[PDB]
Amino acid sequence: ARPPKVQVYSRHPAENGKPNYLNCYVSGFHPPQIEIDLLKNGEKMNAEQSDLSFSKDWSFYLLVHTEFTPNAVDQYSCRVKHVTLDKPKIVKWDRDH
Amino acid sequence: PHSLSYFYTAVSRPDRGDSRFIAVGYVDDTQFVRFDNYAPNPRMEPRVPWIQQEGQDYWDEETRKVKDNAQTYGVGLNTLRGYYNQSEAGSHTLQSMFGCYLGPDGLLLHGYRQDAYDGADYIALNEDLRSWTAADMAAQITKRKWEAANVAERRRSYLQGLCVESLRRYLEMGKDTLQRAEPPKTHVTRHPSSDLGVTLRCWALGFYPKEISLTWQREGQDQSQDMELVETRPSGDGTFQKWAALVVPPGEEQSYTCHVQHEGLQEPLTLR
Amino acid sequence: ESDTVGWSW
């Protein structure tokens, strides 16, 4: 079994008040059973999930994404549950990454 | 060269002896179709605008073929469970990737078909499309079976025929987009976030296809600098992004350069 | 367009 790597990031460089798209890319995991949630201030956002696909080394990847408009106060994150993780992995969005 | 590729994932259930089957199809790095056998009355479905130019006959026939394929992978999960002497208590996975690259004459350039069981290489068609490479002793059973039945010729006939012909059709159908590479939009950001130094981050956004190289260079050293490098990731609109970062001493930012290589660039790119 | 996969492993 291989654990997931998790990246949280915007489609375009984030600017407060400018509509944008928030992405949680989860990759490199095996087996394919996985639970992925995009969170706004800790609350699950309604977000699309890509069709299950995999890379040349057979590990799987998924993108979970939705629209969002960054501002000064809201915090965004991604939570992932997988058999390889004793606790859910949470990665917080930061506009410098 | 353009390519047409399919990715099949079959997963068994510790339950009622049935299995989940997901298929995705790509032209180059552009996903254009999907199939999922848990949907009600499952169909092959479009996943990009241009493929919606196909008539309902196309979707009917692709649905028939992928539903049959899903049945085959359901049987294969059981067979491989038997080969490896595994119980029926746990879930297992069977994956295939196959596809074709288009040559300069409009014919097959390179073709492939590879299978993995529980995430490890199982069996692969060799480059000559006439022989197999088995990864262990269960795969040897499969290899003898497929050699005796000349399954390789089925694969070769598909790759040299319908695969490349349908790929040419797709390239014409999506000619407004599939012939495009998008060069990276690039910039360097500076983060004086720590006494450890100044972080410089070199960003490449919105590029297609996904292959790219970002490297940091320091004046007076030939080798690439050690860096923080994230895995290439989708932007969500079909393009990709990547960045590479490192920490440099406070006054020395100008002696570092980020070098970007991508097929959409007309010359290699040097940023500071 | 899809391959036709039908032979047992």
Author numbering:
A (entry chain B): 4 to 100
B (entry chain A): 2 to 273
C (entry chain C): 1 to 9
Original paper wording:
MHC-I is a cell surface glycoprotein that is responsible for the presentation of both endogenously and exogenously invading pathogen-derived peptide antigens for immune surveillance. Peptides anchor the antigen binding groove (ABG) via interactions between peptide residues and pockets, denoted A–F. Polymorphisms alter the stereo- and electrochemical environment of the pockets, dictating their ability to accommodate different peptide residues, thereby influencing the nature and quantity of the bound peptides (4–6). The key residues, residues at positions 99 and 156 (residues 99 and 156), adopted two distinguishing manners to alter the peptide binding plasticity of SLA-I molecules, and their molecular mechanisms were further demonstrated by the corresponding crystal structures.
To explore whether the 99Tyr/Phe micropolymorphism influenced the P1 residue, we created a mutant peptide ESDTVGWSW (EW9 for short), which was only P1-Glu different from the NW9 peptide, to test its binding property to SLA-1*13:01. The mutant peptide EW9 could easily renature SLA-1*13:01 as expected. To understand the mechanism by which micropolymorphism 99 affected peptide binding, two complexes, SLA-1*13:01 with peptide EW9 (pSLA-1*13:01EW9) and SLA-1*13:01 (F99Y) with peptide NW9 (pSLA-1*13:01 (F99Y)NW9), were crystallized. The comparison of the peptides revealed a significant difference that 99Tyr could form a hydrogen bond with the carbon backbone of P3, but 99Phe could not. To understand why EW9 can stabilize SLA-1*13:01 but not NW9, the force between P1 and the A pocket was analyzed. The CD spectrum showed that the salt bridge between P1-Glu and 170Arg almost compensated for the loss of the hydrogen bond between the backbone of the P3 residue and 99Tyr. Thus, the absence of the backbone hydrogen bond between 99Phe and P3 residue should be compensated by other pockets to some extent, even if the affinity is not be the same as before. In comparison, 66Lys,70Asn, 73Thr,155Arg, and 156Arg from SLA-1*13:01EW9 were stabilized the peptide conformation and required additional hydrogen bonding force to pull down the peptide. The peptide conformation of pSLA-1*13:01 was almost the same as that of pSLA-1*13:01 (F99Y) (RMSD = 0.175 Å), but it was quite different from that of pSLA-1*04:01 (RMSD = 1.110 Å). Therefore, other pockets must provide additional binding to maintain peptide binding, such as the salt bridge between the P1 residue and Arg170 in the A pocket.
